[PDB]
Amino acid sequence: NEYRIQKLYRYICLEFKNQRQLIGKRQEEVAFDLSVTAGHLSRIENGKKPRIALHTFLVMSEYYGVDFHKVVKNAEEKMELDE
């Protein structure tokens, strides 16, 4: 139960990291666009901040132009692929 909760959270964060790597942008560029530090974005992408607001993930979905439900589904699929 809690393992899946933590694991899915990590995969959602890593899905956002993949969204950035897919489009070839550095952390510093996306961070500037979002008015956050590069370190803040990096700690989100790598799953180190456990209590990030849903709002932040919705902002990032809007920034990348990907539906948040698709981010979540992608994370679930990748979590299963790695299993």
Add this chain to the structure above:
Amino acid sequence: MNEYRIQKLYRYICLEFKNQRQLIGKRQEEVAFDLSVTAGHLSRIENGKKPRIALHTFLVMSEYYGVDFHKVVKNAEEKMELDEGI
């Protein structure tokens, strides 16, 4: 950045949890006890009144209700598009 859509979608996600609770017939007081929060706290979450709730909280509630969070979010997006066209 579409701040209007970001904020509305957040509230549609929260209200989707109110809908998920109602579909299975549990009262607020029961869920508040199981999730170790006050009934008032749960009510403010379900009604979209607290804007900075952690994603973790929604993952916990999805597991509690036995509903996949991606379906919760998809339901919210679709209902917002139907109601508001965005």
